[PDB]
Design a protein around this ligand. Sequence first.
Ligand SMILES: Nc1ncnc2c1ncn2[C@@H]1O[C@H](COP(=O)(O)OP(=O)(O)O)[C@@H](O)[C@H]1O
Ligand SMILES: Nc1ncnc2c1ncn2[C@@H]1O[C@H](COP(=O)(O)OP(=O)(O)O)[C@@H](O)[C@H]1O
Ligand SMILES: Nc1ncnc2c1ncn2[C@@H]1O[C@H](COP(=O)(O)OP(=O)(O)O)[C@@H](O)[C@H]1O
Ligand SMILES: [Mg+2]
Ligand SMILES: [Mg+2]
Ligand SMILES: [Mg+2]
Lengths: 380, 369, 371
Amino acid sequence: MDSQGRKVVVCDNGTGFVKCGYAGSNFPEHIFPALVGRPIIRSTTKVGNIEIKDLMVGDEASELRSMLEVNYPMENGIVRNWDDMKHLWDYTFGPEKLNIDTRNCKILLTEPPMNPTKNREKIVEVMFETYQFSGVYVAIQAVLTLYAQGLLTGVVVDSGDGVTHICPVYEGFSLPHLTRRLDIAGRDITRYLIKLLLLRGYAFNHSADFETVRMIKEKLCYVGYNIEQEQKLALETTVLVESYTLPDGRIIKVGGERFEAPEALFQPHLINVEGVGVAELLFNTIQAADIDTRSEFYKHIVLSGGSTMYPGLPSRLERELKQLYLERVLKGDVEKLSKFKIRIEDPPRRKHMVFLGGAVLADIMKDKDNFWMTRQEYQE
Amino acid sequence: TTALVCDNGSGLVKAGFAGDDAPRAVFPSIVGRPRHQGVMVGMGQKDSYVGDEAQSKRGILTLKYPIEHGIITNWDDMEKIWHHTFYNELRVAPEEHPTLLTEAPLNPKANREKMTQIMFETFNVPAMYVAIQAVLSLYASGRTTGIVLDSGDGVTHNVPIYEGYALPHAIMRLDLAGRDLTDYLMKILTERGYSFVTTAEREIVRDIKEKLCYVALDFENEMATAASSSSLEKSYELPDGQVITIGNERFRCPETLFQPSFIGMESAGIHETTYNSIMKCDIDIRKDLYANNVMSGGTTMYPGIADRMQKEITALAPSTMKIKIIAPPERKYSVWIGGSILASLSTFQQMWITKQEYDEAGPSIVHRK
Amino acid sequence: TTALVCDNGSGLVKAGFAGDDAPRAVFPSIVGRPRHQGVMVGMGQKDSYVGDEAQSKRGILTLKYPIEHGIITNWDDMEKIWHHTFYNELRVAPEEHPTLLTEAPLNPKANREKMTQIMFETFNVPAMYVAIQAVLSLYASGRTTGIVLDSGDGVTHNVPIYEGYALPHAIMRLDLAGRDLTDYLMKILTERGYSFVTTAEREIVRDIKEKLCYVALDFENEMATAASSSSLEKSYELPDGQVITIGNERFRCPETLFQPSFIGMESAGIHETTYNSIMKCDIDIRKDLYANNVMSGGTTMYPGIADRMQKEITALAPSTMKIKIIAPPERKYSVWIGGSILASLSTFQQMWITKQEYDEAGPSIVHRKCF
Ligand SMILES: Nc1ncnc2c1ncn2[C@@H]1O[C@H](COP(=O)(O)OP(=O)(O)O)[C@@H](O)[C@H]1O
Ligand SMILES: Nc1ncnc2c1ncn2[C@@H]1O[C@H](COP(=O)(O)OP(=O)(O)O)[C@@H](O)[C@H]1O
Ligand SMILES: Nc1ncnc2c1ncn2[C@@H]1O[C@H](COP(=O)(O)OP(=O)(O)O)[C@@H](O)[C@H]1O
Ligand SMILES: [Mg+2]
Ligand SMILES: [Mg+2]
Ligand SMILES: [Mg+2]
C-alpha cells in the first residue's frame, strides 16, 4: 500500500478474466471471469432451491451458468455494454472480493495497444465520475510484462483471450510503428473447437456451452510440435482419443481436435482469417526493425497471457523462427544456423505477467507525482 | 603539469597526454539523440549520447558528426565531445594542463577563433596552441622536409615543407575524403540490391569500407578480371547474421580518390594534385620533395594506395629521378604523435598562447601566436 | 509495325502504342489466387486471375503485387502480367512490335538484365529499350530542363536534368509511395475501430485514400482545426453499405510524405529531399531547377500537394528567386506519354537494342546501350 494508507490496487480487465489485486503482491488476488448473466427458465434443465439473483456476475455467473443467459461485457479489448462492465467493476471492488473504499484508492488499469480511442476515454471517465478514485493510471501490456521479467529489451507476444499483439520494445524505447495485431486468439480457438466437435457428432450451442468447451480446451488441447508427426500419430494409433465428462454426465471423446484447434494460431486460414501465423508475423516484425536491434530481439522473445499456455507453444515457436531464419536470412546455410542465438522467455508464471508487471510498477511508483493521474488534474 | 594533445579529427577524436607515444583515447566524433519515445522507468534516458556510448545504442539514435569537411558545423555538440574527452576519457581537469589542438590548412578563420574562445572561457585551460596537422606529421616521421598528404575522414590536403620552411602558396586542399568514399560505397552497393539508407546503417558501410576495400594497381585490369573470373568477391557478415558479398565495389570505391568524377566533382585525383603541389614549388626544391612524399591519415591505410601512388606520380614526373612514397605503419596517428613530440620540446614552451595573453587580446591572438 | 509502350508501374500497368496520346490499356498490376480450394467444375475456371478480373473477383482472391518498391519480386507473376498485356489487353503478337519498357533509378542492376532476357527469349521481340521514368516526364512536359519529382505506387525519386543532361550524382531516391500511405491509412483507421487487414480490403482503403485524402497546407493548424469542427469529416460507403467516417485521418495519411517519421523512416521529407538534390548541383544550374519543378506519378494527385511543396521549398531556398511547380492534370500518365514520344522520334530509331545485338552481347547489353 501507499504511505498515506491509500490502498494501491492493480487491475487487469481482460475480455476473458479479471485479475485484480494489490501492488507489490507476487500473486493476483481474485481471478474471475469477466462475465455477466441473467436468470432464465429452460424446460430441459432442473430447477432447484439455489437462489439466482435477478442479475449475476463473474465467478458466480460462470458456475450457475446452467440457468443463466450469459454475456461477456468486453470483446477484442473493446467494451460492448458499458452497463455490464459497470456491474463487473461493481463486483470487482465489491464486498465479494477487493472490499476497497474506492474513493481512497489508487488504481492501475491497463489498455491493449492500438485500441480504439473512445474506449480509453470512457474507461478513464468512469474511474473519476462513478468510483471517484484518488488516482488512476493506464499502463501498457508490453512494458508491464517486461517489468515482471525485469527486462528492458524484448518483443512481447501477448496472446490474450480476444486478440494477440506483438510489440517490440528496445532498451525501454517504444517502437510503435512495429506493433502488429493478429486477430486470432483464445476466443476464436474455442469457436473453432466447437465447430470441430460438431463434426464428431456432438453439439454445443447455448451460451452455457461456450464456457464448457473452454474448459475442454484448457484441459485437453495442445500445440503440436511437428504437425506431420501428430497427424501420423492420430492416423496410426488411437492413443490421442481422450474422454471428457460434460456437466450433464454425457461422455464425449476428443481426438485429433486436441491439436487441430490450437493450430489456427499458426495457419490462420483454418478459421478464415487471411494472413500469416503468429510465428511468421513475429518474424516479419523483427525483420522490420533497424538492422542492429534485430540480434537483441531474437534473444528476448517474451510470451504472455493464457493463450500461450498450450503445451508446446514455445517449442513450436522456436522451431518456426529457426526455420524462417534459415530460409530467409541464412539462405540455407544450415551449418551456420548453429550460431543463431534465440531465447523464448517462457516463465510458468507468464499467465499473469501483465498483472505481475503492474504490481511491480505501482510498487516502484506508489508515491511519486508525475505518474498517477489525480482527480485534481481531472475535469479540466 | 603534462601537456594535453587533442587531435579533433572529423571522424575520430584522438586525445592523450604529451610525452607518450600513442593516444590514450580514440573514439568516434559522434553525438546521438533518441529517435523514439522512452517508455520505461529506470532506463538511462539521457538527452544525448557521445562517442562509443552512442555507437553502441546506435539502433535507436540519429547520429550526427559535429565536424563536416574539417569545419565544426555545430559548436553545441563540439563542446560536448571535448567535455566527454577531458572528464570521462582522460579523467583529467583541463584547468591544469596546457592543450595543443590541431586544424587543417585553408580553413575558415572563424573556426580557429571560436575553438580558442571555448578553451579559455569554458575549460579555463592555462594555455593552448593550434598546429597545422600536416606540419605535425613531419615530426612523427622524424624529418625536416617532405610533402605531406593527409587524408582524413573529412578533408584531404597537401603541404610541402623544405628544411622546415613551409610554402603556403603551394598548399592545396580537396574536400574528397573518407566520408565521400562511404556515401559512394552506399550508392554502388544498391547495384547488388543492398540498402543502407539510414545514418545508423552508414556505420556498417564504413566498417565494410575499412575491412574489404583496396586500391587497384591498374584499374581496367581489375575491372576486366572481376567481370570474367570473379575471384575478387569477398563476403561480409551483417550485425543480424545476413551475409552480403561484394566484388568490384571493393576497388571502385577508393578509386574515387584518383577519379573524383565518380562523385562528379571535376578536381584532380590525389596523385595529380600532389604532382601539382610539387610543380608549384621552386625548381631546386622539387628534387627533395619527390624523395620524401609522406602519407598520413587513416584514408591512406588502403592496401595498395602507396603502390598506386608511386605508379601514378612516376608517370607524371620526369623519369630521371627517384620517387619514394613514405607510408609508416602508424600513419593513422602521425598527426597525434607529432603533437606529443612538439608539446614535449623544451624549445616549444614559449609558443603557447597563455591565458594572460588571451585576456589582453581576445580570440584574434590565434592568428599571431 | 509500330512500337508498343509498356510502363511496368508498381501499381497500374499502362500500355498502348507509340504515337498515341493516351494508353489504350490501363489495368492493375496484381495477380490473384483463390482463397478457397473448393472449385466446382467448368466454373472455378482458372488457377489464377490477372489484372481487372482479379480486382472484380477480389473477395475470393488473395492478391499479390509482382512489383514491390519498384523491383520485380515474382518473375513468374510478372511474366503473367506481360503476357496478359500483349495477348489480352492490346491483342498484339509481340514478336513483331518493338516495346519500350521503363524503370526507376538506382534499381539493382540484375533487375533490368533479367527483364531484357525475358523480352528477347520469351516474347522474342525485335527491339526494346529501358528508359528512366523521370527522364520520360520531361518529354511529356515538352521541355528539356527541370527537376522531376516522380512519386508512384512504390518509389519516390528525383532526377535533376539541365539543358538535356542528367546529373547522376544528384539523383535521390526514397522508398515512400502510394503503398505505404495506404498501409498507414489502414493503420490509423484502427483509432476509429474500422479494421480491414485483408489484402482484398486494402484495395478498398486504397480507393478511400484516392477519393478523400488531401495534403494540409499547414499541418498543425489543420490538426488544431479538426479538434474543433466536424467540417473535415467525410463519410464513405463500403461495398456492403456500411458507412465509415474519416476526419483528420484524411490529411495525416499523405502528411507522412513530408514527415516520414510517422511510419518510422529516418529520411527527410520529399520537399527537403528535392532541395538537397538542387544543392548537390552546381551553382549555375540551381537558378533553372527552382523554376522548373515537374511533378509526376500517381501520388502527386493529392489535392494541395503542389501548394504544400511550393510553400516548403520557398522556405528552404534563398528568398531572392522564383520557385514554380509545374503540375499538369495528366501528370499521372506523364511517363507513358514520354515513352510514346521518345519511341516516335526518327533520331531514336537507331538506338533500339535489337535481337541481333542481344544474340552476341547477351543480357549485359542493357548496361551498355540504355544510358
Ligand atoms: N491452460 C490453458 N491453456 C491454454 N489456454 C488457456 C489456458 N487457460 C486459459 N486459456 C485461455 O486463455 C484465456 C484466459 O484469459 P487471459 O489469458 O487472462 O486473457 P485476457 O487477459 O486477454 O483476458 C482464455 O481465452 C482461455 O481460453
Ligand atoms: N584500415 C582502413 N582502411 C580504409 N579506411 C580506413 C581505415 N581505417 C580508418 N579508415 C577511415 O579513415 C577515417 C578515419 O581516419 P582518421 O585519420 O581518424 O580521420 P580523422 O583523423 O580526420 O578523423 C574514416 O573514414 C575511416 O573509415
Ligand atoms: N486521385 C488520386 N489521389 C491520390 N493518390 C492517387 C490517386 N490516384 C491514384 N493514386 C495513387 O497512385 C498510385 C499509383 O501510382 P502510378 O504512377 O499510377 O503507378 P506506378 O507508380 O506504378 O506507375 C496508387 O498507389 C494510388 O494510391
Ligand atoms: Mg489479456
Ligand atoms: Mg584527421
Ligand atoms: Mg509510376
